[PDB]
């Protein structure tokens, strides 16, 4: 299953989500229609070289194709990356440069960010 490499990047759906509660995934809202996004096109898939290398998963989310996503984490402004370890959320906070990244990872800077608690996907009660 999946063994093979297909894209550093992967393509989160409305039903992968899940994956992102297992193990670390970096997530990053982009949009088509958006300017900025292009030019992160680049930065991102340069980060994805290093990516699986540090020992992280890089996915990507589309605001146009996955309306549920979109409000499943409620994103207003874009683009917008997203870190998910073991479940705890962190927004990025860094000018989003293939350096930057790095130390994100590496640097676990991520302790050093306030995590997200409003995630209730899955277990309803209703």
Known sequence: GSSGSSGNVRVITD???????EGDWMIEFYAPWCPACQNLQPEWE????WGEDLEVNI??????????????FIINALPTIYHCKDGEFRRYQGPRTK?????????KEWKSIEPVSSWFSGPSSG
């Open 15 to 21: 039903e992968n989500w899940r994956e992102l509660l």
């Open 59 to 72: 996915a990507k989310v589309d605001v146009t194709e996955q309306p549920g996503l979109s409000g499943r």
């Open 99 to 107: 350096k930057d990244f790095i130390n994100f990872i590496s640097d």
């Open 46 to 49: 340069s980060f994805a070289e």
